[PDB]
Symmetry: none
Subunit: 204 residues, 2 copies
């Protein structure tokens, strides 16, 4: 096989916009306790900018027990429970209380395991087409909160051979909401990808 090295601190240590963009095309890898490796190529992300960002958990420099990850070293995972039963997987970027949410993966490996995991918690485009869908598919839960994506043995990021060029990256309004921050183009996805959670035609 090819020489494989994980993306580390150097990759994660950039501001939220460039990081959210840089994630696109990179391959998120999960290794289950049974040894099964799950891979999904990132096709959709969102930037949360920090204190000024009315939509961010870190609005006004607010640090709470839950959102510790957003204020930890870049690369630190911030995984929280939303609507009681779903997870959102974020990665702390450079910048006070700034992070990147992963929203959608093209599944590459272990699709049958992703299917088993999600059906318990059917189509391939249904597996990772959403921030909480992808968490289920890759057995990611709160136990991953505050772990380091640069160093962890169970989850890591690999440089992916297929990165979108600037013109192929769509910038669009974020999903799930405010004010001027509900409309800001802080969601980024690969143009024409069928794995993306929500298409935005006006932005395209």
């Amino acid at each position: 096989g090819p020489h494989m090295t994980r993306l580390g601190l150097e990759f994660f240590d950039q501001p939220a916009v460039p990081l959210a963009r840089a994630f696109l095309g990179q391959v998120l890898v999960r290794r289950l306790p049974n040894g099964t490796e799950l891979r999904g190529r990132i096709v959709e992300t969102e930037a949360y900018l920090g204190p000024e960002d009315e939509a961010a958990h870190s609005r006004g420099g607010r640090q709470t027990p839950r959102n510790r990850g957003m204020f930890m070293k870049p690369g630190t995972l911030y995984v929280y429970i939303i609507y009681g039963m779903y997870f959102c997987m974020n990665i702390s970027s450079q910048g006070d209380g700034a992070c990147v949410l992963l929203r959608a993966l093209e599944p590459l490996e272990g699709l049958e395991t992703m299917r088993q995991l999600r059906s318990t918690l059917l189509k391939d485009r249904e597996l990772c087409s959403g921030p909480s869908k992808l968490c289920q598919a890759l057995a990611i839960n709160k136990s991953f909160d505050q772990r380091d994506l640069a160093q962890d043995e169970a989850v890591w990021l690999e440089r992916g051979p297929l990165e979108p060029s600037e013109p192929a990256v769509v910038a669009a309004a974020r999903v799930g909401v405010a004010g001027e921050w509900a409309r800001k183009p802080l969601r980024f996805y690969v143009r024409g990808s069928p794995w993306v959670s929500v298409v935005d035609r006006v932005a395209e």
Copy 2:
């Protein structure tokens, strides 16, 4: 208009379970100092069967006595003394019937009709019921009553409390559905 009287001692002077069930479909009325009348149909209650505290004296008074207490230093719960040593019924939810706009300004996001009275503390806020109501008599008070029309109220579910919680089956106004 119809000949309206109010429910009195005879209605309230029953055990906590019969009364908690009997409250469902009755209309609670609150008249504000400005003359505005607020109305809400009781759709969810809880019976408390008793075993004496400086705060629970209300539930140890004659049936129909209000027991209103502060919880989490902010909210209110409205309870009505029934027959039985220390027994009472909590009001948990109302269907808002009139004065909804007042209910909204008293409660004030954008909140809809289903958010006005869908909770024991929501309903007290909505009907301006506070501590100054504690130990008042529901059968005789001038600011708050349980009205009685020429028609009886209109299906009751007995569930665990939040089988001593009772609510109108499938009502969109019940706080928590089992």
